[PDB]
Amino acid sequence: MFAMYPDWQPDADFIRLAALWGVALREPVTTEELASFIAYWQAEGKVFHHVQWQQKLARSLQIGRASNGGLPKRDVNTVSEPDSQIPPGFRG
Template sequence: MSSRILSTNVIGIDDFMRDPAHVLSQAQGGTVAVFAHNAPAFYALTPARLATLLELEARLSRPSSDVSLDAQFFEEPAAAPVNVPMGKFAMYAGWQPDADFQRLAALWGIGLSQPVTPEELASFVAYWQAEGKVFHHVQWQQKLARSVLMNRNSQGGAPKRDVNAISEPDNQIPPGFRG
């Protein structure tokens, strides 16, 4: 078995045990690799070398600048995990896309300016429940993103007209009308 030796000073464990203080005083750099059975068993350090290494570690752990960045800008928002079946599954009532659905849709090239409304989600689930097709969770989310985008674009951004609404008659007479 090969191993990397991190010191130029190497000694057997029996020789080290006879006079450890003398071995360390003779070590260049204050480090000795102690071998047992032709492999490094441990490293022995002088107090001066240990102090140097600890000071170096402390210096490296301190920032080199007095500017500190707020950790809140680097944390991902903790979203509650969505419980989804493994593998392919048929659409079911209560299915929900992931909490970061809008970001995922953008990664798929579908920019949704607003989150999916409960009505849009209910319409999608009802349609695909009746179809009985099976897809993976990510595929369902991609279908939802495309469906929402197509529905929103087909309306031209205007709210959908209520077919049950009764229109108001126009009481003005157009110019030039003879009646």
């Protein structure tokens, strides 16, 4: 894997890589979104490979924007801590 520090700044590489990774960024990046990623990134204290980073940041902004509409909350309670299982698909 490959670790890093939360002192990185946004640049063209962010949109360039994201666009190639499979993410089309239209509107500028928000602070809540950026801070969120850094919050879990530093809180995790783990390491992720290059490919893992592309997928993490990709699926994060991909599934994040699609959900970002009315109000991202989803308060159901009674959960055993989900590990992001059961990915999306076509379902037929």
